[PDB]
Amino acid sequence: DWEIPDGQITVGQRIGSGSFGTVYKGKWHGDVAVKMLNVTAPTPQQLQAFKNEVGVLRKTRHVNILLFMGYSTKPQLAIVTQWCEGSSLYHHLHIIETKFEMIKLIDIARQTAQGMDYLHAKSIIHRDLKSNNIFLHEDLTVKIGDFGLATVSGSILWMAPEVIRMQDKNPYSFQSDVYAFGIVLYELMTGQLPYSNINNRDQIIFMVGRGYLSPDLSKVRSNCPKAMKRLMAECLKKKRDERPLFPQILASIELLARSLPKIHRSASEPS
Amino acid sequence: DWEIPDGQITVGQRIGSGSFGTVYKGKWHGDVAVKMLNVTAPTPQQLQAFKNEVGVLRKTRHVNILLFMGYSTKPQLAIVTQWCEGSSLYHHLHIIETKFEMIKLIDIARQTAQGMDYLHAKSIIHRDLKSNNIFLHEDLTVKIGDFGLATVSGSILWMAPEVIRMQDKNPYSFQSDVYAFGIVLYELMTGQLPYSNINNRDQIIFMVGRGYLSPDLSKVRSNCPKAMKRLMAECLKKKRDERPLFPQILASIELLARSLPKIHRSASEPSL
Amino acid sequence: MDKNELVQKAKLAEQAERYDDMAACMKSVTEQGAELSNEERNLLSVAYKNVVGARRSSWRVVSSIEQKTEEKKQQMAREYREKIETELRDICNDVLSLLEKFLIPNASQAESKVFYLKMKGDYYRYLAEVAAGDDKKGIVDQSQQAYQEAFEISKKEMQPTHPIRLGLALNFSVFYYEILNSPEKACSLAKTAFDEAIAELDTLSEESYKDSTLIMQLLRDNLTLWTS
Amino acid sequence: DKNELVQKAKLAEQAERYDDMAACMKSVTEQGAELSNEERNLLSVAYKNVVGARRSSWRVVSSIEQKTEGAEKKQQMAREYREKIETELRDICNDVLSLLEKFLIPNASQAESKVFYLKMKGDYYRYLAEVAAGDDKKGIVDQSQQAYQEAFEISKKEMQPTHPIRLGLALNFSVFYYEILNSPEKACSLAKTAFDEAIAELDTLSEESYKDSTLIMQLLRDNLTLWTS
Ligand SMILES: CN(C)CCOc1ccc(-c2nc(-c3ccc4c(c3)CC/C4=N/O)c(-c3ccncc3)[nH]2)cc1
Ligand SMILES: CN(C)CCOc1ccc(-c2nc(-c3ccc4c(c3)CC/C4=N/O)c(-c3ccncc3)[nH]2)cc1
């Protein structure tokens, strides 16, 4: 039972907006991050989504998954997690335009694939993978947060055509989760926002549904190994059943990590 | 429920022993740590302790607490937790005796004090504090393990005098961990094992158990601030009802952390 | 090997971490009578500071061993240590000699005058850090006005957000605590240098802010350690 | 004396003055007595550091010269400075090499001693091999491998395959083929196998040998990955 009593959590500087509200840098046994709706008289159906969010984050315990500390009822419906100091993957790639080494790119890709294997091993689907959701704790470890739309619309750049064409009431599938990882893989290696030469939204939503849209692999860095290119293509496939599950993607990346030239000059006697 | 189907939790290279089991470097959804006693058909009373250990770890959710991922019943009783890149602080002070930094020594001290403060909020008592439990995760973060003996005998250096006296069924208390933490703060600042003058066990229990022996702060290094030295004496008091609780400990450590000086005693360095 | 050609040779030595050859060439450049520009001033400062820095650190670690062993191990450390000052003294004497014949006498602009005087007083201070005995009193006496004369020149015709004046104040403060043992005076003048810096943030351009703020934090770092 | 020079060199190690350290240890070898393990290491580290600085100095200036084309005067001025580093690397390499050929190898008694100085002789020939050019370039490449082959043959017959000295010989020998002779297939062939037999006898590996070997073992694996790509 993680139902925290009222008055035990403070609120600091406003960090940003999450899934269904705003997140704050709280103070509860060290620096934490608390998400609240800051709206009085919560909507009756809004409580239904909030209780499931706590009821799904309570089943995740992994180094690569955001650590859920507790939730509050009064005076506000708030949920609090750990504080991953630093920034997010969105800030690193699209705000600051940071550059990482080839070993680092695989490290982020392997870890976010590592944690997602745990999520699908518990029959839990995240449904909102996106570079805003890849938090780099202490600049090394990667944590998967923002379980607002989890189960057991926001931006459309990171969803799937299988949830665009208005399918059965359960279009969110494991392969749909896999696709969002593939777009993230495009963001990592290419170092550019997908569809850079398109500057509208209404065209994007229809075009991906009919299968006429897919990220172009021309922006991929030349130093990227050919193994990722095959994996990227096999993960960006339009059809559902022809996309590999996370364990095979997870095992594919670990194979690539070993065969990577960490050092650029031949190593001599360490002495 | 946190039941894991058997077979997934592989077992790797042996590292050491735990409370009443042996730890391994396993593989279960990534690099993990698993501790098992490798004794098939276990005694029913050890299962109760094993069952109670999970009931306590399932109530801990913190950065400074070792992350409990799950527990395995078959083929052998075990729990699977996080794997800390590196070793315990004991290995950093008794195997390699790392020349630690004062600005880091306060930061590692503050993190530990923060860890037990969260534990005491949930009315959880560890009762097994020592330098072999301060897991330095890649030299930045600190986790607290060995929750087998804990609840909601020990090592002959890291107990308070009250529990050595063999008092009533619950001799450990909130302040008992504080003295154990104070013993920990002794090792960080001195860089040396406490009670190093006595090499025996029968003598040490009698002298410290009744209160005739207490650690001496002569070996603390010179550049240690006076404020930190006073705190060490304030937490190692003989009687439990006067030791400062963890909430006061955190504030005192953080108060001197802001005023803590840096290294390179003088600058005189333009970039040029 | 004219002025332009000799400057390039130092830059290659700078990139190759050949500080001895860097200082040897740069010493020749300033020994031709030409008026050094802004960039040659940095090359000369970098060349002679790095060579002293390695020797200063060698003495500092050696001195720690000598006084922490109490035969024959003490004399061998002393004999080795005595070799360190010898290398340190002539390299410091060389800079002091060259400053007073070619740089300072021809130093036209005051901002160039204060740099050399600031750089000049350091090498007395470096010798002061290791010279023991009656010579220590004399050597520190010559350094005091060099810091004082440089400080007052910047006090009038030079901005207090300028890195050199802020660097001089950082370099002027360290002298009292590390040699004269006067923390009360060192912190007092560090504060007014700090206070004069914080009051005119609305004047620096988009070029000199980086070096000024780097030195700015170094003043704070010493002040916190000094106030302990 | 003996102890005084050992202490003098050890004192110079903490002061980061390797030039004085190398000079002191040079006279220890000329004394004619056998060198124990702790003083053989001091010989290696003192001479490796002093030549390593020149190696980096030559490497950086050489890269500058090739990237500054178009102006012959800038290209011209880098050549004589490179030759200054070229010759300065030559005296220090010749100093140890002449010391090796006159006082170290002939006075060696143990088999492990002979291979250790043979590896150094090939190493200091390789350092000159990587920098020299012309007709004499292949000659010093030739003599370097003869020292290596003599060292490699002796190492296998006596020392265990988990011995760090043997690991260092194989690691240095593998780099010699790829970087100098440009034969990755032969370099990888020995590098690929040399990892395995040390793995094949990890049971007899001692705790003291666990620490130092794994740095060399991982470097061999690290080198293999670079050459594979
Ligand atoms: C839009 N404008 C504010 C620009 C800037 O945009 C944003 C900047 C930053 C963010 C941002 N959200 C989170 C975030 C996301 C999800 C959740 C939480 C925080 C607390 C619990 C939770 N449940 O979903 C964080 C963050 C988390 C952990 N450690 C550090 C930071 N950061 C969100 C938007
Ligand atoms: C030096 N002397 C004490 C000899 C002996 O040395 C040892 C050295 C190191 C260790 C050592 N025990 C753990 C340990 C302790 C408790 C628990 C686990 C591992 C997994 C489950 C658990 N519950 O408490 C670890 C470790 C933990 C996390 N990540 C990496 C390692 N390491 C045990 C003994």
Author numbering:
A (entry chain A): 449 to 600, 614 to 732
B (entry chain B): 449 to 600, 614 to 733
C (entry chain D): 1 to 70, 73 to 230
D (entry chain C): 2 to 230
Publication passage describing the model:
RAF kinases are essential effectors of RAS, but how RAS binding initiates the conformational changes needed for autoinhibited RAF monomers to form active dimers has remained unclear. In quiescent cells, members of the RAF kinase family localize to the cytosol as inactive monomers, maintained in an autoinhibited state through intramolecular interactions between the RAF regulatory and catalytic domains and by the binding of a 14-3-3 dimer to two phosphorylation-dependent serine sites (pS365 and pS729 in BRAF). In response to signaling events and RAS activation, RAF interacts directly with GTP-bound RAS at the plasma membrane, which ultimately disrupts the autoinhibited state and promotes RAF dimerization and kinase activation. Here, we present cryo-electron microscopy structures of full-length BRAF complexes derived from mammalian cells: autoinhibited, monomeric BRAF:14-3-32:MEK and BRAF:14-3-32 complexes, and an inhibitor-bound, dimeric BRAF2:14-3-32 complex, at 3.7, 4.1, and 3.9 Å resolution, respectively.
To further investigate these issues, we isolated BRAF dimer complexes from mammalian cells treated with the type 1 BRAF inhibitor SB590885 and obtained a cryo-EM structure of full-length, inhibitor-bound BRAF2:14-3-32 at 3.9 Å resolution. It should be noted that despite the presence of MEK in the cryo-EM sample fraction, no density corresponding to MEK was observed in the 3D reconstructions. Additionally, the RBD and CRD as well as other regions of the N-terminal regulatory domain (residues 1-448) were also missing from the density map and are expected to be solvent-exposed and flexible. As expected, a 14-3-3 dimer was bound to each C-terminal pS729 site, forming a stabilizing bridge between the KD protomers. In our inhibitor-bound BRAF2:14-3-32 structure, interpretable density for both C-tails stops at residue 733, indicating that the C-tails (residues 734–766) are flexible after exiting the 14-3-3-binding pocket. In addition, density corresponding to the RAF inhibitor SB590885 was observed in both active sites and overlapped with the position of the C-tail segment in the ligand-free dimer structure. This finding shows that insertion of the C-tail into the active site can be overcome by inhibitor binding and is consistent with recent biochemical analyses of active BRAF2:14-3-32 complexes using differential scanning fluorimetry, microscale thermophoresis, and surface plasmon resonance approaches, which indicated that both ATP-binding sites are available for ligand binding even when the C-tail segment is present. Taken together, our findings add support to the model that the asymmetry between the KD and 14-3-3 dimers is not determined by C-tail insertion and that the active sites of both protomers may bind ATP simultaneously to promote catalysis.
